[PDB]
Design a protein around this ligand. Structure first.
Ligand SMILES: *C(=N)c1ncccc1B(O)O
Ligand SMILES: *C(=N)c1ncccc1B(O)O
Lengths: 306, 306
């Protein structure tokens, strides 16, 4: 037992990180097969980051303008092109440690592991959620551009996120691996800001179910409610709606606890209104919304990867 | 910026996990050079786990009684012996992916990454602290025995922890890699229990300094106190004493914030007495004690590994 914020093992990704240098700017890149992916803003100067025309700035560049280094091994750049917001640098070496992979785009409400990275060297690993407003509350310092987010399905790495920038509130925005941003953000210095966020209701319910499985039952209660009356309360506490599909998805967690899904919503209704009253749940004083039902079924039962 | 619970990248350790089978019991092992380390209770039956004489139960075993499997590759066991509470199985193959490593023993108050593991397959990675009572609040299900904890110093893996069991309160006990338990626990089923714990004061102060660096200043204040008067209050809130060495260690974090160490203790004094008053600190409603000063200087400045 126990419950903790848990990432996938990062070794399969660690074998794909490189550093890309163009001009005076050094960032991270992702090396799969014979291609290195990285944010396209690596070609930009400081005064280019204002109003850039990236088509214009890229035709002014060469194969040799780009330096790639995989640890203590230098890669020859043999081609370059822009796909949406990323640069895609053909190198003369197919990564000998290329895993099975996919490029998927995730939904807000889903989670992923991040491998934060500096000068092509992995520094740390941690779990994240895609916020309803398409930001992520990460930990990234200067030089972490190009660090990726990923999920692992037995032996297959689903890359889902590439880091691009930090917004005013200290949160981060990026793209999927085909270079299309998550949310209404752009790679040119403007006054862009995050936008209003919500709490991910379905995840909170999944985490309450994790706490019952681990022995915190003080917030359980006899009562029930309707899907409709519970949405009246989540609306007023800036929690997103719950659907019959969210209910059907919680089914397996309901049948292991014997707590009908609507019964747990009545619990959540009271937590929202009465607070937690000096107690905690899974060592937290907060209703935690960054675990999905799948995450719970992962830790509170058992699935490994290869 | 940002601040999150962050582990070291796990790839160097992932290359060392195997599964060990003896009788009907399957657990994880650590393969460095030509030796596999694992909890010695793998040789025990169900009714052996009551009052075992491990010297007696091991001489009754053979080299072939032990099956080792590194993924889809089987290892020949050519020798076996007990070192304190672990088994140390000589195999005919030196792990081709043995990293630089050390076997160190950590102090309570220090942190480490765990790679949780099932049938020799890594499942997840997460950061932990050694509690003052020598337990760890982990996430481990049945079959995770032999999973290790570790720190990474540039290219060197300091292995510090091997998991052995789960205690009644859902916390976990284990050994260092020389087989000596952390704390007063034993590998034979008794009524053993965790013992009273404390909050790690020096770490809380380091985390408050992380929140100033990231922009949470609402708990700062003008006042100061003495090292002695602050210990009167930590004594009454079950927080361990603070020493002049803890003060000297916080020095660098004091000079980056301009908040004298004793000034931050007055902050902590008021948080303990007045509560947090419906606010949060680094997305937490709780005073967080599982980051050391080094962890803060790691994320809030920058250090990577290779
Ligand atoms: C990437 N280099 C980066 N990471 C975090 C914040 C800001 C930036 B930036 O685009 O330089
Ligand atoms: C290891 N197999 C283990 N992990 C967690 C809890 C209990 C146990 B046990 O020793 O079987």
């Amino acid at each position: 037992s126990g419950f903790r914020k848990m990432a996938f093992p990062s070794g399969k990704v660690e074998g794909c990180m490189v550093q890309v240098t163009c001009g005076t700017t050094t960032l991270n890149g992702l090396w799969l097969d014979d291609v290195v992916y990285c944010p396209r803003h690596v070609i930009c100067t400081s005064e280019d980051m204002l109003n850039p025309n990236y088509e214009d700035l890229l035709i002014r560049k060469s194969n040799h303008n780009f330096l790639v280094q995989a640890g203590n091994v230098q890669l020859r750049v043999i081609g370059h092109s822009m796909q949406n917001c990323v640069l895609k640098l053909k190198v003369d070496t197919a990564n000998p440690k290329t895993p099975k992979y996919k490029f998927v785009r995730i939904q807000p409400g889903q989670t992923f592991s991040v491998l934060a990275c500096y000068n092509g060297s992995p520094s740390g690993v941690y779990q994240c959620a895609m916020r309803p407003n398409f930001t992520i509350k990460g930990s990234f310092l200067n030089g972490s551009c190009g660090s990726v987010g990923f999920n692992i399905d037995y032996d297959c790495v689903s890359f889902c996120y590439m880091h691009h920038m930090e917004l005013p509130t200290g949160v981060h925005a990026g793209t999927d691996l085909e270079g299309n941003f998550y949310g209404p953000f752009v790679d040119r210095q403007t006054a862009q800001a995050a936008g209003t966020d919500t709490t991910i209701t379905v995840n909170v319910l999944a985490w309450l179910y994790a706490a019952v499985i681990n022995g915190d039952r003080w917030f359980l209660n006899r009562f029930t409610t309707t899907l409709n009356d519970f949405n009246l309360v989540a609306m007023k506490y800036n929690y997103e709606p719950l659907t019959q599909d969210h209910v059907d998805i919680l089914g397996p967690l309901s049948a292991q606890t014997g707590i009908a899904v609507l019964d747990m919503c009545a619990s959540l209704k009271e937590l929202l209104q009465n607070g937690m009253n000096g107690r905690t749940i899974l060592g937290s004083a907060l209703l935690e919304d960054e675990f999905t039902p799948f995450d719970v079924v992962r830790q509170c039962s058992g699935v490994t990867f290869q």
